Amino acid sequence: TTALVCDNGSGLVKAGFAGDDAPRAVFPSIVGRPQKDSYVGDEAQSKRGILTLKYPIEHGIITNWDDMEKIWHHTFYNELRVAPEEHPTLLTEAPLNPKANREKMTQIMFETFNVPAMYVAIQAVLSLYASGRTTGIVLDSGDGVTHNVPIYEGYALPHAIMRLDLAGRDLTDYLMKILTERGYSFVTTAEREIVRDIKEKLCYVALDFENEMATAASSSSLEKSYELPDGQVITIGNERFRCPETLFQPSFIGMESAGIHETTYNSIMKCDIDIRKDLYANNVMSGGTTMYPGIADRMQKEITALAPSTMKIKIIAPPERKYSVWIGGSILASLSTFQQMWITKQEYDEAGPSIVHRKC
Numbered sequence: 001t002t003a004l005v006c007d008n009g010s011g012l013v014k015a016g017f018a019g020d021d022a023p024r025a026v027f028p029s030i031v032g033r034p035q036k037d038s039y040v041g042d043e044a045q046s047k048r049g050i051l052t053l054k055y056p057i058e059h060g061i062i063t064n065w066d067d068m069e070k071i072w073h074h075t076f077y078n079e080l081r082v083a084p085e086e087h088p089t090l091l092t093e094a095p096l097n098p099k100a101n102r103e104k105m106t107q108i109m110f111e112t113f114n115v116p117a118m119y120v121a122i123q124a125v126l127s128l129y130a131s132g133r134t135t136g137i138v139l140d141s142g143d144g145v146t147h148n149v150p151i152y153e154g155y156a157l158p159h160a161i162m163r164l165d166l167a168g169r170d171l172t173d174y175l176m177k178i179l180t181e182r183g184y185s186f187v188t189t190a191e192r193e194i195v196r197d198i199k200e201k202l203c204y205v206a207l208d209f210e211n212e213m214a215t216a217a218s219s220s221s222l223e224k225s226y227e228l229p230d231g232q233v234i235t236i237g238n239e240r241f242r243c244p245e246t247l248f249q250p251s252f253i254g255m256e257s258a259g260i261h262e263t264t265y266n267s268i269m270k271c272d273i274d275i276r277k278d279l280y281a282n283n284v285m286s287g288g289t290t291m292y293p294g295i296a297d298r299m300q301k302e303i304t305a306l307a308p309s310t311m312k313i314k315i316i317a318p319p320e321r322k323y324s325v326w327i328g329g330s331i332l333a334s335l336s337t338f339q340q341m342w343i344t345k346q347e348y349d350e351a352g353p354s355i356v357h358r359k360c
């Protein structure tokens with residue numbers, strides 16, 4: 001038998017088998033309900049007109065357990081084709097996921113899917129493992145939420161975790177907006193899926209945002225063309241970098257919040273002076289919203305301006321960081337040493353859902 005790894009994302013569930021290269025299944029974390037009573041994933045948004053879409057894991061934390069039960073059922077069966085009772089299951093959780101939450105995750109796995117063994121891991125922590133580190137600060141930016149998670153000797157430091165409710169979804173919505181100002185009209189849900197493609201293929205982070213704005217304002221050198229599905233060809237200029245600039249200037253979208261460079265900085269400063277140098281030198285970036293070109297070089301710049309002038313700063317941005325969290329779980333669950341760390345069904349029958357407070 002082989003173990004299972006399920007990354008419960010705010011936008012995309014990444015599912016597969018421990019030991020594997022990448023996730024075997026990647027689909028939207030959406031539950032639709034009005035020839036069935038509930039659809040999950042891709043076909044849930046295809047029939048979005050006849051269904052009511054639910055977002056049970058937005059902002060990282062699971063809010064509806066009936067919806068989430070449907071996603072897990074759709075994952076074991078309709079996506080991975082496995083008997084959950086035959087395979088141990090590793091679930092991921094958001095940073096600062098409360099105790100009452102982990103317990104219900106553990107309860108469902110054993111009572112509703114009857115797994116033989118399970119475990120819950122922090123997503124940021126797994127990403128760091130995937131980069132071959134047990135120490136360093138992770139910037140996880142996904143669909144619905146962004147996190148700074150400093151980690152030392154293999155464990156997250158909850159005290160210094162920063163949560164920023166601004167991510168790829170908000171940038172999609174912003175790009176739709178500034179493209180509609182440009183002269184187009186990207187308003188409908190089907191046009192959101194299109195503007196999301198544009199975002200992922202033509203946007204980048206400007207090293208000097210001030211300079212790029214002025215470059216695009218006096219030359220066509222930063223313009224690209226994008227063909228829409230109906231054949232129409234549109235042109236995108238400064239919108240390419242104004243979109244992900246929002247990560248650094250959340251005021252673009254109307255947030256009083258700080259940029260991802262500041263939350264990274266502020267996160268390190270909450271950590272003990274001894275380990276700060278290790279963190280500065282090990283910024284590992286995780287999640288789809290960190291896939292922009294030149295975002296690493298920008299973090300390299302912005303942190304340097306915030307850190308002590310002597311401080312050695314390195315930004316690690318792995319090419320596979322879109323599945324960094326998943327790959328990490330797949331590595332963790334592949335260790336022999338980790339096998340005793342599973343919560344077994346016997347251990348659950350004897351101590352109940354509160355066993356997860358001593359194992360995870």
Ligand SMILES: CCC(=O)O[C@H](CCOCc1ccccc1)[C@@H](C)[C@H](O)[C@@H](C)CCC(=O)[C@H](C)[C@H](OC(C)=O)[C@H](C)CCN(C)C=O
Pocket residue numbers: 121122125128129130131132133134153154155156331332335337338
């Ligand atoms: C592609 C593989 C890879 O990236 O390698 C990583 C670093 C190791 O370097 C090479 C190596 C690997 C094995 C043997 C010798 C040398 C691995 C090993 C990671 O750092 C990671 C998977 C290790 C996990 C741990 O050591 C943590 C801290 C502990 O887990 C176990 C199995 O002992 C810890 C008890 C759990 C902490 N945790 C998950 C907190 O949330």
Ligand SMILES: Nc1ncnc2c1ncn2[C@@H]1O[C@H](COP(=O)(O)OP(=O)(O)O)[C@@H](O)[C@H]1O
Pocket residue numbers: 008009010011012013141142143144145167168169172196199200201286287288289290291292322
């Ligand atoms: N190459 C890319 N460039 C920019 N954004 C991307 C890219 N790939 C994925 N994304 C964005 O990342 C988000 C998905 O990230 P993910 O880490 O799966 O989120 P979560 O795991 O929190 O659900 C989506 O909003 C998507 O638009």
Ligand SMILES: [Ca+2]
Pocket residue numbers: 007009010123142287325
């Ligand atoms: Ca994620």
